[PDB]
Design a binder for this molecule. Sequence first.
Ligand SMILES: COc1cccc(-c2cc(C(=O)N(C)[C@@H]3CCN(Cc4ccc(Cl)cc4)C3)c3ccccc3n2)c1
Ligand SMILES: Nc1ncnc2c1ncn2[C@@H]1O[C@H](COP(=O)(O)OP(=O)(O)NP(=O)(O)O)[C@@H](O)[C@H]1O
Ligand SMILES: [Mn+2]
Length: 270
Amino acid sequence: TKAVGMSNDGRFLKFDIEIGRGSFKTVYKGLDTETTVEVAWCELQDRKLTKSERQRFKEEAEMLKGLQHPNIVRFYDSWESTCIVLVTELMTSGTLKTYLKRFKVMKIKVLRSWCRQILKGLQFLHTRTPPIIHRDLKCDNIFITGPTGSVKIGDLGLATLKRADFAKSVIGTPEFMAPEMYAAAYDESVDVYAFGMCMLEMATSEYPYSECQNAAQIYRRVTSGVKPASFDKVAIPEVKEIIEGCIRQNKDERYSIKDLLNHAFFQEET
Ligand SMILES: COc1cccc(-c2cc(C(=O)N(C)[C@@H]3CCN(Cc4ccc(Cl)cc4)C3)c3ccccc3n2)c1
Ligand SMILES: Nc1ncnc2c1ncn2[C@@H]1O[C@H](COP(=O)(O)OP(=O)(O)NP(=O)(O)O)[C@@H](O)[C@H]1O
Ligand SMILES: [Mn+2]
């Protein structure tokens, strides 16, 4: 295989082998010539980027490079070319979503094992300094790779660091706060909620709130107490109980990640 592109330091090679195509992302097979391991060479549509924002991207790419956990996709490097190139760990066995689109009843042994690996990944992110909130957890952003089909969370593009103050680098809080503005102070529990929906999808082989017609309808049913229609189809009571504790409307009522890892369901080792 001949290289059609190279990183400036000469470490990463690009091959003209397309392994994935997104709406704003094309992924090519690549090679890390320092380890002779292949990698994913991701080409992203570069937005109009202000110079401060380009500097924040480089700052955040250094943080991402320092992350190392068995259940998080490894991030190797980023740079600009003429688009933005991201080099990450290559996921050889596709996303969790494609497994659900091929089969209809996941076995509970796999549901327990794969969900436990997801929780270990989230626990890692949520215990960094500062904590990292993924914000974009879905079965398309969870990958399977390697001989034993290990589970890893990827695609941290929508992630954010957890902060305390209302505005960034400007202390203070508004007095005539609109209700939606008061609710904008969410935390890592939004990842618990998304995990509950992923677990619901894996347990039912159905997209949550499939019965709804558009994105707008999706909300009002949660708040009025109406869970997804597929929720009432979970046949394992312990599984249904875990999902319910994750998608509770009030965040303070939900599981934390550590509470989920201490659950009897995930404390089973078989
Ligand atoms: C393991 O990681 C991965 C895996 C796969 C993909 C990306 C990945 C990485 C980037 C990227 O390079 N940056 C700098 C982004 C800008 C926003 N920002 C939030 C954020 C802040 C702080 C922190 Cl600690 C973590 C995340 C990170 C990216 C950019 C644009 C579009 C998609 C992208 N996908 C990252
Ligand atoms: N690290 C990776 N290793 C191997 N294949 C990947 C990797 N990342 C992404 N892909 C493939 O590239 C495709 C496009 O990625 P992506 O843009 O995240 O999906 P998408 O179809 O745009 N949906 P969304 O998740 O909403 O962006 C994915 O569906 C994967 O098949
Ligand atoms: Mn994705």
